[PDB]
Write a protein that binds this ligand. Structure first.
Ligand SMILES: *C/C=C(\C)c1ccc(-c2ccc(OC)cc2)s1
Length: 133
């Protein structure tokens, strides 16, 4: 299934700090952020997505249309400019953010009843699992 709508509550997080470090996020922010449970809210209608990632320490939203490149400022995460593109590979939603960092982006897929995601930057992969609230 390609339908990723829902309020997704984190069950598992792995190597979130490695991903943040590859983005050069500073020590103090990483030390706090690595402790935190996350939520991911996805509003999906056709190609049109609204995605929110939140914890007690951040609340980041991004809107996009599958298949349409968008020039993006990454805002409070790392204040960088990238050319972002989200597409489907089978039932995997793949985002590539072209810019200074290599291998940068994320992937999301439904597996069983859960939402799995990968967060990538450089040689680092963060793996996460969420349950649908
Ligand atoms: C589809 C998944 C997305 C858009 C994200 C997963 C983690 C995100 C994130 C954004 C910003 C911060 O710090 C401000 C932390 C995590 S976004």
């Amino acid at each position: 299934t390609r339908d990723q709508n829902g309020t997704w509550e984190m069950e598992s997080n792995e190597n979130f700090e490695g991903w943040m470090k590859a983005l050069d996020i500073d020590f103090a922010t990483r030390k706090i952020a690595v402790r935190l449970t996350q939520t991911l809210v996805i509003d999906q209608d056709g190609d049109n997505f609204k995605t929110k990632s939140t914890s007690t320490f951040w609340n980041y939203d991004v809107d996009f249309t599958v298949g349409v490149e968008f020039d993006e400022y990454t805002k409070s995460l790392d204040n960088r400019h990238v050319k972002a593109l989200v597409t489907w590979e089978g039932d995997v939603l793949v985002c590539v953010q072209k810019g200074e960092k290599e291998n940068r982006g994320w992937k999301k897929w439904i597996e069983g009843d859960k939402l799995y995601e990968e967060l990538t930057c450089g040689d680092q992969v963060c793996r996460q699992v969420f349950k649908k609230k």
